[PDB]
Amino acid sequence: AYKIDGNEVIFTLWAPYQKSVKLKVLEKGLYEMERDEKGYFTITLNNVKVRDRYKYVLDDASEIPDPASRYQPEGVHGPSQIIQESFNNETFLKKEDLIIYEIHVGTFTPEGTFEGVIRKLDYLKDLGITAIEIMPIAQFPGKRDWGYDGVYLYAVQNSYGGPEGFRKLVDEAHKKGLGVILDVVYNHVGPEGNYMVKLGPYFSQKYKTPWGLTFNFDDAESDEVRKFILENVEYWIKEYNVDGFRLEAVHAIIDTSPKHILEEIADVVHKYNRIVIAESDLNDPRVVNPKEKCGYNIDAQWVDDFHHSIHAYLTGERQGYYTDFGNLDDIVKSYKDVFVYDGKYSNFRRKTHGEPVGELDGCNFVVYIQNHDQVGNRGKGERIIKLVDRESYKIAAALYLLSPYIPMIFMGEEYGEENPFYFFSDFSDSKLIQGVREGRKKENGQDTDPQDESTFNASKLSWKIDEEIFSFYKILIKMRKELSIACDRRVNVVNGENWLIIKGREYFSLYVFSKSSIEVKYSGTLLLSSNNSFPQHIEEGKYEFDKGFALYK
Incomplete structure (x- = not known):
């Protein structure tokens, strides 16, 4: 990560595999970093501002984004970017x-x-x-x-x-x-x-x-x-x-x-x-x-x-x-x-x-x-x-x-x-593009192409x-x-072949999956229903209900 410290900023990169790492600040410099024995690399810099872009350059000359990057303006292979520092003590x-x-x-x-x-x-x-x-x-x-x-x-x-x-x-x-x-x-x-x-x-x-x-x-x-x-x-x-x-x-x-x-x-x-x-x-x-x-x-x-x-x-x-x-x-x-x-x-x-x-x-x-x-x-x-x-x-x-x-x-x-x-996915690596298509087809039976934009659009x-x-x-x-x-969790549930009644402290619900005659053990007044076949007020007794749901208070 980086830490803004007054007017300076310190860059920290953990990289034990690496003998020496350079900070490349785009359009500014290349700066050798200091290595501690656990393999953390550091430098403190004076000339870095919000919006500057950077990468790290490794032993083998290759250049990489900051794995703890706070912003990748050009995607996963582009430079990292410095952004403004910022919370409530409670949610x-x-x-x-x-x-x-x-x-x-x-x-x-x-x-x-x-x-x-x-x-x-x-x-x-x-x-x-x-x-x-x-x-x-x-x-x-x-x-x-x-x-x-x-x-x-x-x-x-x-x-x-x-x-x-x-x-x-x-x-x-x-x-x-x-x-x-x-x-x-x-x-x-x-x-x-x-x-x-x-x-x-x-x-x-x-x-x-x-x-x-x-x-x-x-x-x-x-x-x-x-x-x-x-x-x-x-x-x-x-x-x-x-x-x-x-x-x-x-x-x-x-x-x-x-x-x-x-x-x-x-x-x-x-x-x-x-x-x-x-x-x-x-x-x-x-x-x-x-x-x-x-x-x-x-x-x-x-x-x-x-x-x-x-x-x-x-x-x-x-x-x-x-x-x-x-x-x-x-x-x-x-x-x-x-x-x-x-x-x-x-x-x-x-x-x-x-x-x-x-x-x-x-x-x-x-x-x-x-x-x-x-x-x-x-x-x-x-x-x-x-x-x-x-x-x-x-x-x-x-x-x-x-x-x-x-x-x-x-x-x-x-x-x-x-x-x-x-x-859907949006890889650019041709092996990964092939793998995802083949994998989604074999594992999920997906016929639309994950990598086709129209799959996202749909x-x-x-x-x-x-x-x-x-x-x-x-x-x-x-x-x-x-x-x-x-x-x-203090609920009572009764079921038959094709229906469920669930009763809590303040309510009961009728879930009728198929036309059924059902013994209703409670009284109440209708709050909501999936159709209008359920009565406004129900008393204990036996009723023939069509498919649907009803919530009673």
């Missing part, structure tokens, strides 16, 4: 009022920039969302990427609007009473434009993940790599005033140290009173358990079991991981016990999977019927709206929005967006409003708040 977000909205900046808006998301803030606020979640903005190759190919952990993507656009987005979100959560990647680096391998043991020689290589957290020289990650979390908070984080694939962050890097990450976010959420495929409560119960004390985790159980039941799909799901029983299991695989044999995984969650309340978990993976990892990128009828879509929306868990809405879901969301939201769907979402969100549904 105003309360974990239990959290309703999350997932945004891919590039496709969210015709603009495809942060400014584009600023334009939608009033709309999001009025919808009833309390936090936006931004998919990764760490600089990745070209302009079209989900974000997981990011390769400069500190550098806000140039083509989204860079440092200033992001800072402006968070400032405007705060003015409007909305939090921002940044999706961040601490388990891997993208395959194009990363130069760390030339500098030191950033990557493990011990571990292989689905992704491939991973960061080195527990082997020789790993102190400095732990710092690189820990300082990154601190950086987003101080420099951008971010409210929280969503950690990509924590099951791929491998650490056998006495104290797990995941626990240290949560320490950093909590020291600054922020929130962290984990994407975890472990079904293991240690991720969110407090330290006194041997956990990392992360605030919440994504629970795919909830999505899968709804998706597989409603669609009839059993391909890939859906094979582990499909029964109505699975939805009730996840509504009661959170995990469906809570220590039970998985045919998909060919092993016993998961662990019960205990008495953890609902706000340690996040659920959804849609997100970038559950749409985008499908070969044809189909939203669930294309896979179920209108009533089923509404029933699915109710099931998660009225659950004890923190709900996350996928951009466009709420107004009935029909456009696909495809996997994934852009249309903003074509289905008013009836939008109204339904809006009222759901509002009723969730009024009924104090959030976090509260």
Whole structure:
């Protein structure tokens, strides 16, 4: 990194593999750097200002961007740039009022920039969302990427609007009473434009993940790599005033140290009173358990079991991981016990999977019927709206929005967006271009070309409003708040062949998947319905209901 110190600025580069490194300040000089014995290279300079461009030149004369670059104006292979130094001591977000909205900046808006998301803030606020979640903005190759190919952990993507656009987005979100959560990647680096391998043991020689290589957290020289990650979390908070984080694939962050890097990450976010959420495929409560119960004390985790159980039941799909799901029983299991695989044999995984969650309340978990993976990892990128009828879509929306868990809405879901969301990338390396095309075709059955611009264009939201769907979402969100549904796992669930009744402290819901005669054990007054066949006031008794959903107070 660099540190601005009055009128001077000190450049620090960690590079144990390197005998000697030069700082090349574009159009100024080449400056020999001083080397300490742990292999940190330094110089303090007097003639450097905001906006100056630089690179490092290595033993073998080759020139590289700063791996801790704060800005890559010309992309992943261009020079690094010096930017203005910048936060609130607290996030105003309360974990239990959290309703999350997932945004891919590039496709969210015709603009495809942060400014584009600023334009939608009033709309999001009025919808009833309390936090936006931004998919990764760490600089990745070209302009079209989900974000997981990011390769400069500190550098806000140039083509989204860079440092200033992001800072402006968070400032405007705060003015409007909305939090921002940044999706961040601490388990891997993208395959194009990363130069760390030339500098030191950033990557493990011990571990292989689905992704491939991973960061080195527990082997020789790993102190400095732990710092690189820990300082990154601190950086987003101080420099951008971010409210929280969503950690990509924590099951791929491998650490056998006495104290797990995941626990240290949560320490950093909590020291600054922020929130962290984990994407975890472990079904293991240690991720969110407090330290006194041997956990990392992360605030919440994504629970795919909830999505899968709804998706597989409603669609009839059993391909890939859906094979582990499909029964109505699975939805009730996840509504009661959170995990469906809570220590039970998985045919998909060919092993016993998961662990019960205990008495953890609902706000340690996040659920959804849609997100970038559950749409985008499908070969044809189909939203669930294309896979179920209108009533089923509404029933699915109710099931998660009225659950004890923190709900996350996928951009466009709420107004009935029909456009696909495809996997797209924007590599320039011809081997990587070939690999991604072949891999997406073989693994996902993707027929559109990930590297074709029209694949990105087809994934852009249309903003074509289905008013009836939008109204339904809006009222759901509002009723969730009024009924104090959030976090509260004290629910009673009854099911028959083709229906579910779920009762909480203040409400009951009827989810009728197919015309059924149902014994209703409660009295109440109708708050919301997926059609108008349900009565305003219901009393205990037996009723024949058509497909649909009804919420009673």
